[PDB]
Design a protein around this ligand. Structure first.
Ligand SMILES: O=C1N[C@@H]2[C@@H](O)[C@@H](O)[C@H](O)[C@@H](CO)N2C1=O
Ligand SMILES: [Ca+2]
Length: 455
């Protein structure tokens, strides 16, 4: 049984969370990720990733009993004295961000203590000549190093909210100073295309690499997101961040924005040495949300028009599929041809890993416009998750074929961001309380962990 006050859609999200958590608790407790189909688990860093990523979601959904049990695990089983290499970015947005939000929501100092411990262990990654951090760092030995080879731009520019907040709470300025150094370096770095940034950067030279190739998908997405979010977090005082964000959006309009045929769906493609590619990762669906968030905070009304158009397109990326779930990547038709549909998907990209981007943006579009249809769209997507990704014994799994409702083909994996992001954004989307994690008081990191806006 669940709280009587909850509207039916939030109640529904809770039901889904509980079924998902049932699987985690039974077959992967304390492990990074659940393997629902095989009733097993998988380890990435060995730091209870799914548990930490879901802490704030449990608190927000009112699952206090579950939260307490998870809190106990953090207190007794989470140890950073381990010989393991972690990705600075992935561990920052999930672990550091997740512990920080858990700390703020619960008021439990345990989470802050663990966050400060982890933050210190990540610092060796910034020990480079350019000060642009290495991609990986061994939290136990203290040695940092690049991938098995430069660092990716999104990775070094999407850890700022977390490190800035850790400094604010601890009084230890080294975290903030380290990440702000990278932000400042990126700002004056050449190699950009009207605000658009390359996907990689060399830690030794500190220069952009893989020049002339731009995308807002994997390897770059959150860079644009954090320009705006840092500005918001800092109390809208850091004009350079705002300016870079505004320039970037214009760069998007000028180089990556196109429309499909015959429906004229607005979308963002990729550019490689002058050649446009009508390819759009689902990851890019974070944009309408970020755009709307900006509008709420005073950005151009043109950003809102773009946000609504892209939200519609992202919704269609889901609804045009037989399962109602968007695939990993979607290609759009640019030229006139009758009978030719707008959305196309390659056989290799028909997987759905329970990603949050569409529901994330629906949350922002609803909060800013108050248009109930965005809630309706989110409810439809949740129905699809329940119908095609549910694992009877517990949990939900990524699927290989979004186009076959009879045989979706589970991949036997529940990404940590399903409980950390996807279900949190849906719960919030269904709330009709603008004061629940208000856009005026909190800013979500890129893994859906809310952090307080500074005064
Ligand atoms: O490329 C990725 N960027 C996103 C992240 O910003 C975050 O949302 C999840 O880690 C996950 C969600 O879809 N991320 C990716 O795999
Ligand atoms: Ca994200």
């Amino acid at each position: 049984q669940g709280p009587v006050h909850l509207n039916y859609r939030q109640k529904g999200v809770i039901d889904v969370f509980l079924h998902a958590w049932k699987g985690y608790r039974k077959f992967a407790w304390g492990h990074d990720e659940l393997k629902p189909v095989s009733r097993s688990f998988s380890e990435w860093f060995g730091l209870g990733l799914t548990l930490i990523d879901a802490l704030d979601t449990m608190w927000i959904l009112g699952l206090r009993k579950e939260f307490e049990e998870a809190r106990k695990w953090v207190s007794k089983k989470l140890h950073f004295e381990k010989d393991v290499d972690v990705n600075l970015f992935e561990s920052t947005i999930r672990i550091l961000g997740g512990l920080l939000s858990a700390y703020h929501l619960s008021g439990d100092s345990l989470f802050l203590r663990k966050a400060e411990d982890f933050g210190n262990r990540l610092m060796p990654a910034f020990r480079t000549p350019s000060k642009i951090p290495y991609s990986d760092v061994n939290i136990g030995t203290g040695v940092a190093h690049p991938p098995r080879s430069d660092s990716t731009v999104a990775e070094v520019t999407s850890i700022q909210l977390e490190f800035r907040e850790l400094s604010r709470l601890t009084g230890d300025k080294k975290f903030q100073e380290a990440v702000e150094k990278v932000t400042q370096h990126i700002h004056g770095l050449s190699g950009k295309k009207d605000g658009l940034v390359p996907m990689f950067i060399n830690t030794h030279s500190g220069l952009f690499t893989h020049l002339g190739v731009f995308t807002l998908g994997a390897r770059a997405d959150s860079y644009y997101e954090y320009l705006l979010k840092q500005w918001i977090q800092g109390g809208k005082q850091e004009t350079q961040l705002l300016e870079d964000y505004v320039e970037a959006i214009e760069g998007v309009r000028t180089h990556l924005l196109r429309h499909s045929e015959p429906s004229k769906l607005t979308f963002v493609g990729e550019l490689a040495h002058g050649r446009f590619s009508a390819k759009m990762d689902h990851l890019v669906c974070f944009l309408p949300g970020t755009l709307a968030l900006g509008v709420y905070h005073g950005l151009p009304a043109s950003h809102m028009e773009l946000a609504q158009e892209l939200m519609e397109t992202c919704y269609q990326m889901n609804r045009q599929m037989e399962t109602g779930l968007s695939p990993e990547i979607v290609h759009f038709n640019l030229y006139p041809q009758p009978g030719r549909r707008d959305v196309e998907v390659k056989p290799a990209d028909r997987h759905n890993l329970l990603r949050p981007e569409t529901v994330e943006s629906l949350f922002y579009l609803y909060r800013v416009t108050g248009d109930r249809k965005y809630q309706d769209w989110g409810w439809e997507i949740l129905q699809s998750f329940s119908r095609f990704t549910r694992v009877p014994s517990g949990g939900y799994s990524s699927i290989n074929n979004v186009q076959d409702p009879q045989k979706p083909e589970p991949r036997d994996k529940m990404e940590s961001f399903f409980l950390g992001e996807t279900l949190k954004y849906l719960f919030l989307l269904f709330s009709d309380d603008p004061n629940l994690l208000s856009l005026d008081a909190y800013v979500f990191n890129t893994e859906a962990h809310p952090l307080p806006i500074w005064t």
